[PDB]
């Protein structure tokens, strides 16, 4: 006897993991929820124990998708939180199309399709200057799209078309930089920084900040993976949130300089912050020969064995550390009644804690 | 039959007048509220018709203060939202002391004292400003005010709250100096002279993130701390919960006035708005008459020097996490808060 039935596409992702968890809490709106979890890989060891119906499916394969997803006649809400490789139009588009084409004609009580994109929706060729343009940060919803290839635009168009043709409600969610960790999706800014801190500690080296001066001192924002799930569940159940494009972030701002000090304290090591006259260095380049050291750290500290290149994305930290002026606005969600938030500093530390609890660090 | 009785000290202030209105709203927590409002001037025309018991009292004059407030024995909550000097270490502290000294012995059901200061407490520290930040080594009288608050409440079994509002967006006819009124006056003059809305500030302040607080939200925040046990005995920041940029405020302001704007120009450096409006006093008098406005003198409605400070300010964002983690979920969209303040001045015919 479930009140609502979720199809979570990308259940192995960082947000998809949070959804499967949050949807199954006893107090969750729309509940009690039944949850199907779709991903490409064979059923993970991590999701196996969970009250989630795992479905292994390559959703780029339409025929396989029809076979696996057509029998699911009871679906009421689709949460599409999947993304595969790079930012590629046609591949993500076909996957999204395949999901809808398989479920829509088969789920008679389907109500809502939640589509997750991201703040990269707002990104163009140019950095923001002194002129005033609706595309400036703080990024707000319901601005015109940039005339630039953006695979998020394709996904949105498919969403609007299919839900419009079939009398379904929709919601688009644009999460900021995600703080989170999933054993099936290890790549994240938090895990990357934690691996660096671990390596520094192992080598008896200080936590040396390699990034630019601007990224050290400028305001930044992010979103906790659990908050994204809460936000998507809110839009799935609350009539006020229906047919809305919505940003999703923690509701506050932070500075990498403050995160850095917290990171060093959590690891019990010294830090070197930005040094005047010492320009940005590539963390990816600094870590390029550390794969073997990571394997040694893993065995010495009895960690779940991971390969360095699979748990850390140092290049992505390099991007974050030369980024600026990317704040997104949460006003629309708040004006619509969604009051979820996180303290970003506590959110960062709690992600570290989760990595510890899973013995990845 | 009132549930709580408020003493609002500085009721003609921007936050004070907000407190007067919000406290009397039908569903205000801790209500129904009875409201005493204290200020120096005779009862203003603007608060005359309002359900507020107005008391004229110069709270620096102790004798007058004891005379006027001691009989008010039904007071349950004190909202001290008064400030008088540019920076008077001794005057502001004596004012606050006299209030406490005159009310505490006589109000047997006094529960809580709300002290309002501001983010100037932090600046200097780096931002985002958080409440746990220790005081700077500087004669700040916020420190003095806080110290008086802590011990008088400590000695008398009263709860306390300290509120540090960011830059205030708001308007009061009895306290017209605000960034919003200042910028609207400039826009009005520009429009009158068939000139564009020219931005005089620095590049950084044009492009950087800034934050502010609606005066009505400060009122709600202070009321919340006065009634919610979770909020008791806490230092609390108060801002709108979002960020904005002056560049966007500027364009919005120009659109609202239906005029062209000249934003920051890459080469140019900051010019004094105060110096720009040097000899516009007579021009303002002509605008007032031509547009049938409530008569104000330029030097009374605008504070161009303060806009000049805002327009060379940067890195001043404050955090609202502590209030939110304690259960306060009030917010404002800062852009809409700015426009709402314009509309209010328009409704009162100041512009």
Curated annotation (Swiss-Prot), chain A:
Top-level EC class as recorded in UniProt: oxidoreductase
Keywords from the UniProt entry: Cytoplasm, NAD, NADP, Oxidoreductase
Tissue: Expressed in internal phloem-associated parenchyma (IPAP) cells.
Residues annotated to bind NADP(+): 12-14, 40-41, 58-59, 82-83, 116, 152, 178, 185-187
Molecular functions (GO terms): identical protein binding; oxidoreductase activity, acting on the CH-CH group of donors, NAD or NADP as acceptor; protein homodimerization activity
Keyword Ion transport: no
Binding residues for substrate: 120, 152, 323
One Gene Ontology cellular component annotation held by this UniProt entry: cytosol
PANTHER family on file: 3-OXO-DELTA(4,5)-STEROID 5-BETA-REDUCTASE, NAD-DEPENDENT EPIMERASE_DEHYDRATASE DOMAIN-CONTAINING PROTEIN
Function: Iridoid synthase that catalyzes the first step in generation of the iridoid ring scaffold using the linear monoterpene (6E)-8-oxogeranial as substrate. Iridoids comprise a large family of distinctive bicyclic monoterpenes that possess a wide range of pharmacological activities, including anticancer, anti-inflammatory, antifungal and antibacterial activities.
Assembly mode: Homodimer.
Name by which UniProt lists this protein: (S)-8-oxocitronellyl enol synthase
Lineage, broadest ranks: Eukaryota, Viridiplantae, Streptophyta, Embryophyta, Tracheophyta
């Amino acid at each position: 006897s479930y009140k609502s039935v979720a199809l979570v596409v990308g259940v192995t992702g960082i947000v998809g993991s949070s959804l499967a968890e949050v949807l199954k809490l006893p107090d969750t709106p729309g509940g009690p929820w039944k949850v199907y979890g779709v991903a490409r890989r064979p059923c993970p060891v991590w999701l196996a124990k969970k009250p989630v119906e795992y479905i292994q499916c390559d959703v780029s394969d339409n025929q396989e998708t029809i076979s696996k997803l057509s029998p699911l006649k009871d679906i009421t809400h689709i949460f599409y939180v999947s993304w595969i490789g790079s930012e590629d139009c046609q591949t993500n588009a076909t996957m999204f199309k395949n999901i809808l084409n398989s479920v829509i004609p088969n789920a008679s009580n389907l109500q809502h399709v939640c589509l997750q994109t991201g703040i990269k929706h707002y990104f163009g060729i140019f950095e923001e200057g002194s002129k005033v343009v609706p595309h400036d940060s703080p990024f707000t919803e319901d601005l015109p799209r940039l005339n630039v290839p953006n695979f998020y635009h394709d996904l949105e168009d498919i969403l609007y078309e299919e839900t419009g043709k079939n009398n379904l409600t929709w919601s688009v969610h644009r999460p900021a930089l995600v703080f989170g960790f999933s054993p099936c999706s290890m790549m994240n800014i938090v895990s990357t920084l934690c691996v660096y801190a671990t390596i520094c500690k192992h080598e008896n080296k200080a936590l040396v900040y390699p990034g630019s001066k601007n990224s050290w001192n400028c305001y930044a924002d992010a979103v906790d993976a659990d908050l994204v799930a809460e936000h998507e569940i809110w839009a799935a159940v609350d009539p006020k949130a229906k047919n809305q494009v919505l940003n999703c972030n923690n509701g506050d701002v932070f500075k990498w300089k403050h995160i850095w000090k917290k990171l060093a304290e959590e690891f019990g090591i010294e830090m070197v912050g930005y040094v005047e006259g010492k320009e940005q260095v590539s963390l990816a380049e600094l870590m390029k020969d550390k794969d073997q050291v990571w394997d040694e750290i893993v065995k010495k500290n009895n960690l779940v064995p991971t390969k360095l290149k699979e748990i850390a994305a140092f290049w992505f930290a390099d991007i974050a550390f030369c980024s600026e002026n990317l704040i997104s606005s949460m006003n629309k969600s708040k004006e619509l009644g969604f009051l979820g938030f996180r303290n970003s500093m506590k959110s960062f530390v709690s992600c570290i804690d989760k990595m510890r609890d899973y013995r990845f660090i």
